[PDB]
Nucleic acid binder design. Sequence first.
DNA 1: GGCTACAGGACTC
DNA 2: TCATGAGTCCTGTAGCC
Length: 341
Amino acid sequence: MIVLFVDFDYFYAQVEEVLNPSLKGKPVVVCVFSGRFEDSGAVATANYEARKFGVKAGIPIVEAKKILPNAVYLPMRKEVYQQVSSRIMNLLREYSEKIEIASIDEAYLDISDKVRDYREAYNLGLEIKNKILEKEKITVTVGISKNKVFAKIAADMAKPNGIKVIDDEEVKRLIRELDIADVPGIGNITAEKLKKLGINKLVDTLSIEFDKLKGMIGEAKAKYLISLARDEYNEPIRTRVRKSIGRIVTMKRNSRNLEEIKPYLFRAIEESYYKLDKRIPKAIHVVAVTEDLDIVSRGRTFPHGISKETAYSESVKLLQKILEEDERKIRRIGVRFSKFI
DNA sequence: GGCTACAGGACTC
DNA sequence: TCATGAGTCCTGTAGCC
Ligand SMILES: Nc1ncnc2c1ncn2[C@H]1C[C@H](O)[C@@H](COP(=O)(O)OP(=O)(O)OP(=O)(O)O)O1
Ligand SMILES: [Ca+2]
Ligand SMILES: [Ca+2]
Ligand SMILES: [Mg+2]
C-alpha cells in the first residue's frame, strides 16, 4: 500500500496571508481571545516568521506579545479557514476515492491503485502540491510511505512547503533511529514513561517484556508501538464521521453559583445546536474546567434524541451534579453532544 | 470473563 | 493577570449476564 498524506502549512496564518498579501513576510499570530481581560487567551497558531522566535500554538497571547510586541495579532476566524479547507479537500478527492480527512488541514489518500511505485507517487505529490497552489495559493507539505503513520512522519520531516517519501529501507532505518517521541500518538507524558524504561526508539519496544510495557503505557499504545516496530502496522484509510459536537466557553470570572453559570451554559448549548445542524444527539455531557484547570464532567444518554429544550433542562441537572460533587470553582463551562441518530 | 456506560487521561489539530 | 477551543480514542470501575 502507498499512502499520500497532505498537511497544510501554518494553516490559519497562511489563510490570513492569502486574504491579505501585505502580511507575507511579517510574523503573524492567530489568537483565541477568551475575554476575561485585555489579551487573555492563547495562540491558535503563527506563521514561521513568528515561530522562529518561540511564538507557537498553545502559549498565552500575553507571552507572545512580550516576545514579539510588533507582530500582527489576528483573532482566529475558524469559519473562514474551514471554507478554505473544504475547497482544498475537494481538490484532493480528484486524486483518489480512498481518502481520509483527518482534520481541518490533513488528508490521507490511498493511491495504491493510482500509481505503480514511489517515483510515480512522488510525482503525483508534486502534481497535488501544484494544483492546490494554483487553485488556492496555499502551500502544503506531502508525506508518502507504506502506511498512515509513516506518511505523516514523512510530512513532519519535510515541512513547510515540502514533500518526502519514506521507502521500505528508510522505514527500517527509522524504526531503529527515529526518536520514539516523534512517533504520532506519543506525547510528553507517554514519552517520559518510555524514556524511563530506556525506550528511546521504536525497535526498543521489541526487547522489553510486553507485560511491563503494557503496564506502563496501556495495552493499546503498547500494541501500537510494537506493531510499528515490527513494521506490521496496518490501518485503513477510512471516511471519518464526526462523533460529537460541543462548545465550551470561558467565564468572565470563576464561580460555582448556578445562576451565574447558567447563561454561559445556555449560550454553549445554543451554539452547539446550531452546529448540530440536523444531527440529533442521544447523549449530552456538561464539561467544566475548574479554577485549577482540571476537567470534570457529567453526562447522560437517553433512549431517544435530545431536543434543545431537553438539552437545557438536563444540562442544569448535570451541572448541579458537578457542583454537588466537586467543591472547586468553575472557570470554563460547556457542553458536548454525541451518539447521533 | 467480558460487555456496557460513565468519567477521567492523553493526544492531536 | 498564563492557562483557547474542538474532537477522538483508550482505560478503570462497577453492574450485569
Ligand atoms: N493548540 C491549538 N489550539 C487552537 N488551534 C490549534 C492548536 N493546534 C493547532 N491548531 C490549529 C492551528 C493550525 O492552523 C491548524 C493545524 O495544526 P497544525 O498542522 O499542527 O498547525 P499549522 O497548520 O499552523 O502547521 P504546520 O506546523 O504544519 O505548518 O489547527
Ligand atoms: Ca498543518
Ligand atoms: Ca511527540
Ligand atoms: Mg498535522
